[PDB]
Design a protein around this motif. Sequence first.
Motif, mmCIF file in Angstrom:
data_model
loop_
_atom_site.group_PDB
_atom_site.id
_atom_site.type_symbol
_atom_site.label_atom_id
_atom_site.label_comp_id
_atom_site.label_asym_id
_atom_site.label_seq_id
_atom_site.Cartn_x
_atom_site.Cartn_y
_atom_site.Cartn_z
ATOM 1 N N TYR A 328 0.810 -1.108 -0.270
ATOM 2 C CA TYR A 328 -0.039 -0.207 -0.224
ATOM 3 C C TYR A 328 0.862 0.890 0.120
ATOM 4 O O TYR A 328 1.904 1.178 0.926
ATOM 5 N N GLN A 329 0.447 2.362 -0.924
ATOM 6 C CA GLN A 329 1.179 3.382 -0.547
ATOM 7 C C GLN A 329 0.333 4.707 -1.040
ATOM 8 O O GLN A 329 0.691 5.590 -0.512
ATOM 9 N N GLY A 330 -0.728 4.176 -0.332
ATOM 10 C CA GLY A 330 -1.854 5.594 0.327
ATOM 11 C C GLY A 330 -3.360 5.773 -1.191
ATOM 12 O O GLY A 330 -3.323 4.853 -2.283
ATOM 13 N N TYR A 331 -4.347 6.392 0.043
ATOM 14 C CA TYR A 331 -5.273 6.782 -0.992
ATOM 15 C C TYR A 331 -5.331 7.786 -2.559
ATOM 16 O O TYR A 331 -4.183 8.498 -2.506
ATOM 17 N N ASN A 332 -5.626 7.023 -3.734
ATOM 18 C CA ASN A 332 -5.824 7.024 -4.845
ATOM 19 C C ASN A 332 -7.659 7.237 -5.803
ATOM 20 O O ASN A 332 -7.549 6.614 -5.907
ATOM 21 N N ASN A 333 -7.289 9.017 -5.158
ATOM 22 C CA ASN A 333 -8.942 9.331 -5.461
ATOM 23 C C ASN A 333 -9.372 8.833 -6.992
ATOM 24 O O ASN A 333 -10.384 9.177 -6.902
ATOM 25 N N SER A 334 -8.518 8.452 -7.987
ATOM 26 C CA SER A 334 -7.952 8.626 -9.822
ATOM 27 C C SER A 334 -7.856 6.955 -9.110
ATOM 28 O O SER A 334 -8.958 6.590 -10.387
ATOM 29 N N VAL A 335 -8.652 5.600 -8.371
ATOM 30 C CA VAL A 335 -8.778 4.621 -8.703
ATOM 31 C C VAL A 335 -9.982 4.825 -8.669
ATOM 32 O O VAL A 335 -10.848 5.067 -7.537
ATOM 33 N N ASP A 336 -10.806 3.533 -9.295
ATOM 34 C CA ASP A 336 -12.334 3.391 -10.072
ATOM 35 C C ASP A 336 -13.025 2.283 -8.353
ATOM 36 O O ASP A 336 -12.255 1.290 -8.930
HETATM 37 C C1 LIG Z 1 -3.730 6.769 -9.707
HETATM 38 O O1 LIG Z 1 -4.336 5.820 -9.658
HETATM 39 C C2 LIG Z 1 -4.489 6.148 -11.658
HETATM 40 C C3 LIG Z 1 -5.331 5.162 -12.729
HETATM 41 O O2 LIG Z 1 -5.725 3.781 -11.888
HETATM 42 C C4 LIG Z 1 -3.118 5.528 -12.174
HETATM 43 O O3 LIG Z 1 -2.933 6.175 -13.481
HETATM 44 C C5 LIG Z 1 -2.204 6.552 -11.284
HETATM 45 O O4 LIG Z 1 -0.883 5.796 -11.390
HETATM 46 C C6 LIG Z 1 -1.994 6.014 -9.257
HETATM 47 N N1 LIG Z 1 -1.057 6.443 -8.740
HETATM 48 C C7 LIG Z 1 -0.387 5.980 -8.093
HETATM 49 C C8 LIG Z 1 -0.258 4.750 -8.551
HETATM 50 O O5 LIG Z 1 0.372 7.012 -7.421
#
Ligand SMILES: *[C@@H]1O[C@H](CO)[C@@H](O)[C@H](O)[C@H]1NC(C)=O
Length: 595
Positions: A328-336
């Motif tokens: 785990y590297q943290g919350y990514n609010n771009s992930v579905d």
């Molecule tokens: C965050 O999510 C997007 C979509 O999965 C991805 O392209 C991006 O690399 C992610 N950021 C990270 C892993 O820090």
Amino acid sequence: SWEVGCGAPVPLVKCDENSPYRTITGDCNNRRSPALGAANRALARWLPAEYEDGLALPFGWTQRKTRNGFRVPLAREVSNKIVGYLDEEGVLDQNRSLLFMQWGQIVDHDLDFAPETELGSNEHSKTQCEEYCIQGDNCFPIMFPKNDPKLKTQGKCMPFSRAGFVCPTPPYQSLAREQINAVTSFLDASLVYGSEPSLASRLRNLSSPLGLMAVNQEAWDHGLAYLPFNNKKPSPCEFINTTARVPCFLAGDSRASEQILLATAHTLLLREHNRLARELKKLNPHWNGEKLYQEARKILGAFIQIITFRDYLPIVLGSEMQKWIPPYQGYNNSVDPRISNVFTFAFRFGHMEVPSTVSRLDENYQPWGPEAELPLHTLFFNTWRIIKDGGIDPLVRGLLAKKSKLMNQDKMVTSELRNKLFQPTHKIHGFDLAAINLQRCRDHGMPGYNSWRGFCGLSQPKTLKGLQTVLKNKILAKKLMDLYKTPDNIDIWIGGNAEPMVERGRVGPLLACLLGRQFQQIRDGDRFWWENPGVFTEKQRDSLQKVSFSRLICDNTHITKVPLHAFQANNYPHDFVDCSTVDKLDLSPWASREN
Ligand SMILES: *[C@@H]1O[C@H](CO)[C@@H](O)[C@H](O)[C@H]1NC(C)=O
Ligand SMILES: *[C@@H]1O[C@H](CO)[C@@H](O[C@@H]2O[C@H](CO)[C@@H](O[C@@H]3O[C@H](CO[C@H]4O[C@H](CO)[C@@H](O)[C@H](O[C@H]5O[C@H](CO)[C@@H](O)[C@H](O)[C@@H]5O)[C@@H]4O)[C@@H](O)[C@H](O[C@H]4O[C@H](CO)[C@@H](O)[C@H](O)[C@@H]4O)[C@@H]3O)[C@H](O)[C@H]2NC(C)=O)[C@H](O)[C@H]1NC(C)=O
Ligand code: HEM
Ligand SMILES: *[C@@H]1O[C@H](CO)[C@@H](O[C@@H]2O[C@H](CO)[C@@H](O)[C@H](O)[C@H]2NC(C)=O)[C@H](O)[C@H]1NC(C)=O
Ligand SMILES: *[C@@H]1O[C@H](CO)[C@@H](O)[C@H](O)[C@H]1NC(C)=O
Ligand SMILES: [Ca+2]
Ligand SMILES: [Ca+2]
Ligand SMILES: [Ca+2]
Ligand SMILES: [Ca+2]
Ligand SMILES: [Ca+2]
């Protein structure tokens, strides 16, 4: 030109800035897109739906409508010819306890539920579907092939009702049919607390400001709680024994009493909520009932997350764990964070890990009474065997000391599920979960085996010999090709589960990829992930690292001895230690605050 518009019935909540706890519905988790992962919305589509008419009709609906120039085989014929076996000897997993199977079903129920369309009762419909086996509207019956013994014994079909779909669930629209996920996509203990405000309130004890969950008022387990009864009629748990007349349990998830060991694991979790609420009240006497309930709920959610990601997924995904689910590297609010439609089929790998029997064991890990071991099919919607036959301790001892079934290319799904499944309102122990899974794949518009192989960067076998090499099994590949004629037409549930298991894992490459991607997304896309900074404190995360299923058992049963690693095969007494030896969850970091 997008149109993310649709999602009609709407649990429409506006979102409060800096709100300290999850919603029950999963709304407001993602700030930019607040419906993301919320209950009662469309399952995500990782690939476009594939339907006979491009919109809504399953492959197999119209007899003369081929898939890629070949008729799709009858779900039950695939079940009979590929999925069935007779001999239970040698089928058990020598390094997974029964708890390994049972935790899978638990996590599955936290994440996804695509219920059959409403249509209600008081209707010539599902009655007619059951009676006359006539395909139409939401009636998509599983027809028996000519040589099927059930054709002789059970009529012309197994009734099957199409899954609910979003916007209308009657008329329909001009995009493809999208099935509903009725529970929260987040791994958030929605199976304990509910995914809807009304159920979540009904589950709570709002009489006392103690933050407790409602418990059974009719029966106790040596002073420890049972879930409340669901007093809705008819009750399938009453139906399976009208002498005992013991109703189903009421839980956060509708399916809690489907089999006695699911109901058992639900009982552990409910007890753990109340134990936590009581302890937080001792620690924090000025915390109100709402605060106690939310803090206990938040801890139980972190427990489920850690057992799942730390102990379960590594022994599912084996060598593929580091590929699909990095540290785990943290919350990514771009992930579905939404559960995909395909995941709800990929996770049915658990169906091949369900063994033919359930055992009750006494305080000495010896057979509980003269029928300690029972056939699984007698325990569908069976709550009376808990209340009236020793409570949950003998069943929990069996979860630790007995083994999961091992997936086997020659012995896929036990006849307890493949021939003797009980479904509510359908009266008989005569359904086929494997055939149901295949029919449901088509119901849900699933792209076939090779579309998912492509999605996962894997080879797409076109010939017998190509499939024999992917499956490492000539006879199984020949049986698949005789029925499906091209690997492009193989239903994802059977093609995924047909693959040999990866090293140190219990699923093949295709499943490891679809499961791994989904679990990576529900972790990384969850703002309330336990390890996300500011969800818990540093000191709380240190305490949470020490959770174990073994401690959950010690704290919430009268079991004196447990194994340290509950998911592996453990034998009594060698692998069992005193409870006093097992790490505890130190709640002192939940002190309101200090100096
Ligand atoms: C965050 O999510 C997007 C979509 O999965 C991805 O392209 C991006 O690399 C992610 N950021 C990270 C892993 O820090
Ligand atoms: C929600 O949470 C609340 C409490 O936080 C739960 O309410 C409590 O439920 C239990 C039943 O499960 C009740 O326990 C019973 O208690 C009696 C003993 O009564 C004495 O002590 C009680 C506990 O302190 C106390 O509440 C009683 O006071 C009330 O009653 C008297 C009249 O007697 C009255 O004068 C007072 O003003 C109070 O109204 C009293 O001092 C015990 O005898 C019961 O045992 C019998 O029944 C059980 C079956 O449950 C059986 O096993 C026994 O052998 C025996 O037949 C029982 O243990 C407790 O009284 C409740 N508290 C209150 C305040 O009502 C509630 O159940 C939760 N609801 C849900 C759905 O989870
Ligand atoms: C005895 C054990 C079990 C029984 C009796 C059982 C029964 C069922 C039934 C009746 C369905 C609905 C089928 C349909 O109508 O399409 C279902 C769905 C499912 N099962 Fe199982 N099952 C069991 C164990 C498991 C296990 C061990 C797992 C996973 C490890 C699992 C994962 C699922 C999933 C994901 C679904 C689909 C949920 C959804 O609607 O989104 N099950 N199961
Ligand atoms: C239904 O539940 C009842 C218990 O309520 C079971 O009956 C018990 O089981 C055996 C009888 O062979 C005895 O140990 C008890 O004396 C029975 N009790 C009663 C009240 O009859 C019964 O076996 C269950 N039946 C089914 C079909 O599951
Ligand atoms: C059982 O599996 C676990 C990993 O889940 C591992 O630590 C152990 O080596 C395995 N035991 C055997 C006998 O393979
Ligand atoms: Ca959504
Ligand atoms: Ca959930
Ligand atoms: Ca209790
Ligand atoms: Ca029984
Ligand atoms: Ca074979």
